[PDB]
Amino acid sequence: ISSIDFTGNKQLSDSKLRAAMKDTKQKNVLRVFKASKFIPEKYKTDLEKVIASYKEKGYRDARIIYDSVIYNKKKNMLAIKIDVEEGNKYYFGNIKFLGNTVYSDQQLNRYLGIKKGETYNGVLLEKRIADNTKPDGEDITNLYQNNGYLFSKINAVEVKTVNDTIDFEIRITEGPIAYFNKIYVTGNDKTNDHVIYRELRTKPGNKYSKEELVRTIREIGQLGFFDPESIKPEFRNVDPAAGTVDIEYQLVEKGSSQVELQGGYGGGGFIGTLGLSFNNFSARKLFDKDAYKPLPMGDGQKVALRLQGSTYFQTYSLSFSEPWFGGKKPVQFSSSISYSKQFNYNYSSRDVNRNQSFNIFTVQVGLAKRLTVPDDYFVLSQSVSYQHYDLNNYYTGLFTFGNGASRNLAYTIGLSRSNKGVNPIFPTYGSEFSISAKVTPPYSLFNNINYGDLQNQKEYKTQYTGTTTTTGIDGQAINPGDYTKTETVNGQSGTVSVGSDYKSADTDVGKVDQKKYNWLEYYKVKFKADWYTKIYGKLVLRTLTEFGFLGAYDQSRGVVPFERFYLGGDGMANYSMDGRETIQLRGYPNNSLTPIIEDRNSSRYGQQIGATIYNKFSMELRYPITLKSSASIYALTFLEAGSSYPTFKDYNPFDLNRSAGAGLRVFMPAFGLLGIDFGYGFDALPGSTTNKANGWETHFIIGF
């Protein structure tokens, strides 16, 4: 409805003047003309916004005099006549502070952010004095009540008004300082009192700090035993004479059990998990009939039963975590026991062979400590792990002991620094540096076994334990319990006995490899570096520089066939699921760039062995899109390159199979971080007939 009729707009231009009102617009060519019609309350609040914009430009004398509506009896629109008196420009002047002893005048003037000659804006002064909209803002009330001056009152008054300039005075009443004297918690019906008290940043004897109160509220909410909307401090026994404030945290319990569904699709298949976890277990009341109602409740110990799965492996795991070991220092203790069954699988060409399978039994114990003051934000994690590998018809890759077993005893030490500020879901700055080293005991230096000459011993050269003297390729029936050697003739193969001439026989590569890898000996190094930077106003660039290394103390023993790096696909797999490290590149199918045996004459060609050395570099640009609360949808682009190799003997870290793509992330309060990604792989999968390049791949990810 054409309803402008602005009589008197000498300074405020018509365009932004109209734009000032949000709801009651006019007739135009927009989306059904912005639904322009008459709404009483919307019209009045729009008019108030007109006056507000006029004052924001710096006119307090602004007013509306004649607002009117005429309805067109012939053409059916409403014309609105608006009459505005503008007034005179106004300047801030001589903002003096009276009643300050703890802060000097210069500091308060710096904090207020108002200088001489700036146009009047009353909302600006009120916001800089007391920040109603945000509780964490940098206002003068917050600076006074963040050092323990709770009983402070600051009011703005006007003393002089001359030559269209204001004279402002701030009356500051300080009062006695504030000290915490009695802090207690009330409302814990199933969580013990010592769990809550040791994670509170408000402590008796300190001075009052509202910023400490907000932080401890957030910490209590993020603990996981209380609903974030129930924590409500209540200042009690506030005494303005002796300076004591007694705070009472009112808490309401929420729940312990929780089901997780981390994993993802993406052409390979479900690589996901399923976990039933109680976050409030108590291992000291496991034999208490009364307390055992949904399994014992109490301290903050977390016990989780997880089933991780895929089309080729099934892993059942039990985990127990104590976030405070010994009761004195925050040393998280994590223990885990898991059993996994996996089958042979060629990631480059989907194929599950169910007659070649092997099992893993793992027991792990670890302590993670927040090491104190070599700068904060550092975590040191140590762990001891024992793993048993039981093979079953596993003649694949570099394995030759298809029916044997392997043992793994490892100690892993890692340092992690995390600044990553400020929003936990969309960083603007910070860095995440993780360095980890896993070592097994150096068996080679101690035991008196020479692995270089292990193949020239009578105990490992085709003994022929078979007791039947049936026949041989050389026309001689093999004498039972005699050394043999394969000697092909014409087109068919065969074996011929040699008697007591083991010096010329065939080495049993299976037995030699079994002795080599009966107790795994190796060292592994991992390196991850995120370097969140800031460009423009919405662009966020993330770098993900990575490294990896696996080696053997005795080069004669060889790099261990287990615990190897596998590049390709998304990174939803872990080391808990299998003995694999599942490097992440989003332009190729899962784990498909792992090097293969490029020996055509070998009976196994496309089988994947693993990579010992890998480097990955990823640059990603992000736009917040709809960064809000209860929903954090945003978009991200990729440019990644990864290079892997099974032997660090002729490595060229200049191949770097490239991947480019873009996608989106969506986050929900309970659904978890969901995501859809698309990517094009510029390079060929290893061991493919035509070069070509892998096409677009869906990358649905969960975690419911």
Partner: protein, 244 residues
Amino acid sequence: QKALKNEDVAAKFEVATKMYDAGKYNKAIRLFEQLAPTYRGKPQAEKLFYMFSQSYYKTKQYYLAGYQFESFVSGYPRSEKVQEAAFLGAYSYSKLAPVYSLDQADTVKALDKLQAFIDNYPNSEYLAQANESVKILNGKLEKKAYENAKGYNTISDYKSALVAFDNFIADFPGTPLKEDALFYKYDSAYQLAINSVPSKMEERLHVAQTAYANLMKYKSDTKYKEKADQMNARVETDLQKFTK
């Protein structure tokens, strides 16, 4: 179970009484629930709504026992055994108090109810047991505060322990845990007075010195005499060096 389907009130009361005498309190509970609004006011309503309570008490449904006993005492004010009902209700509510580490919001209610029973009818054979229950509940309340104060001497917040014990020795005046509080405040004072910056040593060493004098004044033959004496010797052998 025959009376469960039948609707003869006299027969239901008879079978309920037989089970109550025989000790089948659980089924008696079901039958009395069947008759709970359906038998009120009718004769034999003093034996009714009273075995419904004691059956609860013997089957260990303590909250229901308290509710029914409070209803029985609020009703039938001239009952012959109103005193027994009041004491039993108070005691049944008292048995519901949680451990000292949880919210003692039911402990205060139990103490209020038992104090009410002690103020009204201030003479009986149940007065001693009620007093003992009041004492043990107050002990639970005291132990909560003592453990919350000691929870700072463990996580190594020594000053907070020092200002959280000084409002325990004065909030609960007569307590058997006062000796422990004094010792574990002297320990905090010492531990915060030896690992201290050179500029702030003497003041905290004097704060520890006054705590040692407090501990060995209240009880000369304290249970921690050896450990306290070694600590005092260290305090003196460090304060003597700074003496000018």
